[PDB]
Amino acid sequence: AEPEHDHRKRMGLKMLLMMGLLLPLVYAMKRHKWSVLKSRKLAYRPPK
Amino acid sequence: AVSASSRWLEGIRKWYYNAAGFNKLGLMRDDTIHENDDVKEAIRRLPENLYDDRVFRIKRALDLSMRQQILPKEQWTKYEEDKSYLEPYLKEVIRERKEREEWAKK
Amino acid sequence: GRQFGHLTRVRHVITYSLSPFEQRAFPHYFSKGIPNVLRRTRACILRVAPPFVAFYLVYTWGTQEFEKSKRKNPAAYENDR
Amino acid sequence: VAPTLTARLYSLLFRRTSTFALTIVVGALFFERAFDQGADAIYEHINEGKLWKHIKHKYENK
Amino acid sequence: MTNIRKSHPLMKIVNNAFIDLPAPSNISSWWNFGSLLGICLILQILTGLFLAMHYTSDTTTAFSSVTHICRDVNYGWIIRYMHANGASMFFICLYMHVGRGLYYGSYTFLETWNIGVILLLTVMATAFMGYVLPWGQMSFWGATVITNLLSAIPYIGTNLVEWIWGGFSVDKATLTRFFAFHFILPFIIMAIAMVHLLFLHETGSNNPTGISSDVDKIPFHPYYTIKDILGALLLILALMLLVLFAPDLLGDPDNYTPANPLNTPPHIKPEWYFLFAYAILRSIPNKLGGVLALAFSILILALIPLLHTSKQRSMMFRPLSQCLFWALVADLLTLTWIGGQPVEHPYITIGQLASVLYFLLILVLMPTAGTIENKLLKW
Amino acid sequence: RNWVPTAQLWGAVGAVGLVSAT
Amino acid sequence: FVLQGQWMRLCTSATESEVLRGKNLLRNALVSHLDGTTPVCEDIGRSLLTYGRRIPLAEWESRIAEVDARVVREVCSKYFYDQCPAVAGFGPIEQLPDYNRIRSGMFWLRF
Ligand code: HEM
Ligand code: HEM
């Protein structure tokens, strides 16, 4: 029924490890950039 | 004949008010309306203080929605202070429109 | 039409921001989230959770019946008589 | 004083994007191979003797 | 200007729509589905073309050709599975995009929404034909049942159903047509997606708060390109988790049985994405009343705009709305459950009440709740 | 100027890329 | 855009002609300021808390003269190349770049 049963699950292994390195990396990248905005602080000073 | 019933809506109103979280975000009802054609004109008629003030508060609140953080309990809009400051401005805008519509029947 | 200098008017608002490199991406990873995740989930839960809870009861009951009525092949009307 | 491992790495390879790409090209190569070698091994350990690799002995060259 | 690459070529300026575009700061993670929605459509296409590159559109071979794709062709097995599971993701994403339109009132963008509905119905046609492609028992009987549904139309119906099929049954003619339609549909879709983009680029995105964010805009490139990429990583992770470790899991239909034109689908049903409609459909005794109310389930969407009652285009600050919104989502869940249910009492009475609920929630409950909330706020 | 050096690293990259990649 | 772009092109593509002209200019700015009694006082006073007691005036032309365009280009990259700029504006700044944009404006992949 499924010849590809073994390849497939080995692939799953390599796709899980890889993704366990890219999800955490790329999240970092996302905080690298965003940091500017999330760290930002405001101040409102009317002449009024 | 509303004495009991309409002196108690203030309680659901009050319950509702803080239930809708804008409360928490530093925002005020007026600053939550849907920005459409009538509302726009209205906004365009706000005096500089009034109007710079809405800009700051949406600037504060969107800031917060970006960061998913609520303002301090100390610093939150209190229902008792319902500045319906747009209402005045908004009404006429509408009032002028309806007239303009009405004058256009025949 | 230009989108960036024609969006709106803002007067009197100062903003202060730092560079990525001087900063850290993940300040209190867990000590902020926990209580933020907690605090918003607890304000979600009431609004959100209910109708899913209800679906689960309906699911449960609903499948019970089925298996009974059908499995209870005698359910409708008894044997002896 | 010496540069943190990062700073060393930084001034040797990342300042110039040309060097930065090169790096990436070469690491993409080296990394494939270890990943596969490690990852494969890992996998093959979990199914000891289950896979032909393990079993070709029975009917091979007598 | 000189040597500003982007404005130099006119064509390249048209692409700054993904860089220098003002993008709301605050912005749930439910805004990536749009971008995911479009990766999906490219993913399918790619994959697809590849499948089409070794697939044959005949009664005799189709199943065989599929079967050959996932056995003797190199990597033809993932590609196919990737393609099948792809289409679950494309729908999963699809419903997230709409849930958000519903909830934050993005559909205030009258014109953009309309094209959204058009898009949504256009993917539905494509997913309905491609499933037929392999020619499996499930596909063969669902194509018959659904197109024959159409014969409910009184004067034409009957003639019609026959023209669609290109015969009196679903033999070759029918199958060959779906292949071609399946093929070109998505290319037609891509034009639409892009017209969709076109209209939204005139007004920008809405946000959680439900207030203008022109006072708070942010360059798309720096931020949102990273966000999109990350979302795509998460997207791809769900697709491969499902493809690599749970291949048919989601593909309810086990029917890998070539279709014998006289057999019994015990419980024949569209895949998950169409169960709502199905359920909806059964609840009506009469078959024409079922089709109309099958059509209305989906088309209702074009009236949402005209049902909006509040002053806050953002449900976010409106609790009673939130509660019914969620209900309808869980109702919708409940309806999908009925979809795989036997035709019987228990499921009928349940499905009946769930259909009513579903139009009530969209047609009458929510709108009232809108006014109530507006009165409470003294608006 | 700096182009030779940079063109030289750019030429390297394409090379190793093909070689490996391909 | 044009500004940062001139910075970048300076640390990677300085030409001897270009630096040569900017050299000469410096000579003149630094000679011409010293016309008059008050300017010359200043140079002297300040110069002794700044650079200590030296009066580098005549050295200058020597130092200035040491500038081959490579000198100007390597010197330039230390400070500019991939350094985080410090930015300040006063509205309407609504179009003023995002910090991240300014920053990536400090390296050269394209633009
Ligand atoms: C863009 C929207 C698309 C959707 C929603 C979609 C969905 C599907 C689905 C659900 C199947 C059934 C496969 C199975 O379950 O066995 C299928 C099959 C197929 N699709 Fe697509 N597809 C899309 C685009 C395309 C495109 C652009 C092409 C080619 C240009 C294509 C070519 C094919 C072919 C040849 C098959 C038959 C072999 C097979 O069953 O995998 N599809 N598609
Ligand atoms: C082929 C299918 C579709 C594609 C490729 C697509 C693509 C996109 C993209 C890329 C965005 C911008 C990012 C975002 O707003 O999330 C967007 C926004 C939007 N889409 Fe779609 N979409 C699709 C289907 C739909 C459907 C079915 C609807 C509604 C029926 C819809 C309605 C909207 C609305 C209202 C917005 C803007 C909301 C806002 O950001 O204020 N789209 N779409």
Coordinates of C-alpha atoms in Angstrom, one line a residue, chain F residues 5-17:
Chain F
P5 CA 38.3 42.1 -4.9
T6 CA 34.5 42.1 -4.7
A7 CA 34.0 40.6 -8.2
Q8 CA 36.6 38.0 -7.2
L9 CA 34.6 37.0 -4.1
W10 CA 31.4 37.1 -6.2
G11 CA 33.0 34.9 -8.8
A12 CA 34.1 32.5 -6.0
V13 CA 30.6 32.2 -4.6
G14 CA 29.0 31.5 -7.9
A15 CA 31.7 28.8 -8.5
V16 CA 31.4 26.9 -5.2
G17 CA 27.6 27.3 -5.5

